[PDB]
């Protein structure tokens, strides 16, 4: 999948893998960056190797999950030594600090903050790391699956809305649209926001020309 900004293998809920396209190098170079820790999440966001508001939130969120799974699976790893694992409150203190670090990556898009607030709420109601791990896995799956489903929904909402506006105005012809930046599968979990609407419009147009 040439267009997938974030490749999330969720097939082992306890041992997910995450890698991201380096968007600095597209379109001629397709290179993946592994995500293992919050430092990786911070790094790819700050450097704009991953960008796009929702993709930023998704990679950020995923990097917390890979981090907590790594410290479970390798208590001797570099990241694990940041933690006093003997004590849940002490563990949370460092995790919260690292969530604040991640938040500082790039300020303007709000998606990341919105997700990190939710992750903190999950952390505050988890009794131990294991519970947090499981609930965070659920959270990231939901964040991603809702992002894609909602992109399709909004795409169709926007397409229908414009067609209805034009049909009311008695416009009957071919039309063009303008867009800016990147809001497609490269900026999101897939399908996209403004580019989603354009994709929905294209589907409608193909149906019409087929006929």
């Amino acid at each position: 999948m040439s267009l997938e900004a974030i490749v999330f293998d969720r097939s082992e809920p306890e041992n997910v893998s995450v890698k991201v396209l380096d968007q600095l190098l597209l379109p001629y170079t397709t290179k993946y960056v592994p995500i293992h820790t919050i430092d990786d999440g911070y790094s790819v966001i700050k450097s704009m190797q991953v960008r796009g508001a929702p993709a930023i939130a998704i990679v950020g969120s995923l990097s917390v999950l890979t981090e907590v799974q790594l410290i479970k699976h390798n208590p001797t790893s570099d990241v694990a030594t940041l933690y006093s694992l003997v004590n849940w409150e002490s563990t949370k203190t460092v995790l919260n600090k690292r969530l604040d670090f991640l938040l500082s990556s790039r300020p303007t898009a709000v998606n990341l903050s919105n997700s990190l607030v939710e992750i903190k709420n999950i952390l505050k109601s988890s009794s131990d790391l294991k519970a947090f791990d499981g609930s965070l896995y659920n959270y990231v799956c939901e964040l991603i699956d809702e992002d894609l489903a909602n992109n399709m929904k909004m795409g169709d909402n926007g397409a229908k809305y414009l067609i209805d506006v034009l049909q009311k105005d008695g416009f009957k012809d071919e039309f063009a649209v303008l867009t800016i930046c990147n809001t497609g599968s490269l900026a999101t979990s897939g399908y996209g926001t403004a580019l989603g609407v354009i994709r929905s419009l294209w589907k409608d147009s193909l149906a019409k020309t087929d006929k």
Partner: protein, 191 residues
């Protein structure tokens, strides 16, 4: 019945999201498209063989009154759309809503390293024959070129702010929000 027959994505300097990423997606999906410079919006509208009937933009942060932070150039596009009577829509999920910040003036706008403006990243091109320069594994090599004097200062905001007055609709998974007769969005359901 009306149908979309073409897309005009903007290059989107300085990072080139448009030319490097959006043009890639449009090519992949086989959607008929013509990439244009950021500076070409107005002339493109006046000369287009197919009438331009909408701009669709994303968002990075939509605050309580609908004011929107998006990629630098978004404000500009909205102003040009206003001049030419073209509908301008912001398209974003509820996860992009900021339900605390009241207005656009209160948004913190990231400004990035000047070198990201003055130096352009792209695939190395063979000066002799114009083909891609590839490494020993057959993969295109990334290169960077400088397009400005060291001495010149630059302004490199990653975003601008589009006031809600310029936005015809906010399109979300919950529906399309429009302004009332007093010119205000009512986004409460998204908070």
């Amino acid at each position: 019945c009306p149908r979309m027959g073409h897309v005009f994505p903007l290059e989107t300097r300085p990072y080139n999201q448009g030319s490097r990423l959006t043009a890639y997606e449009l090519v992949y999906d086989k959607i008929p498209s013509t990439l244009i410079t950021d500076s070409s919006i107005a002339y493109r509208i006046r000369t287009s063989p197919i009438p331009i009937k909408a701009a669709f933009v994303g968002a990075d942060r939509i605050v309580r009154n609908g004011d929107t932070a998006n990629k630098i150039g978004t404000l500009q596009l909205a102003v040009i759309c206003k001049q030419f009577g073209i509908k301008f829509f912001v398209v974003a999920p509820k996860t992009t809503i900021d339900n605390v910040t009241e207005t656009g003036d209160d948004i913190i706008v990231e400004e990035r390293n000047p070198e990201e403006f003055k130096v352009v990243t792209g695939t190395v091109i063979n000066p002799e024959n114009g083909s891609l320069i590839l490494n020993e594994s057959g993969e295109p090599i990334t290169g960077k070129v400088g397009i400005a004097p060291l001495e010149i200062n630059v302004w490199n905001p990653a975003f601008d702010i589009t006031p809600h007055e310029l936005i015809d609709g906010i399109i979300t998974e919950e529906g399309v929000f429009t302004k009332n007769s007093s010119g205000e969005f009512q986004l409460e359901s998204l908070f």
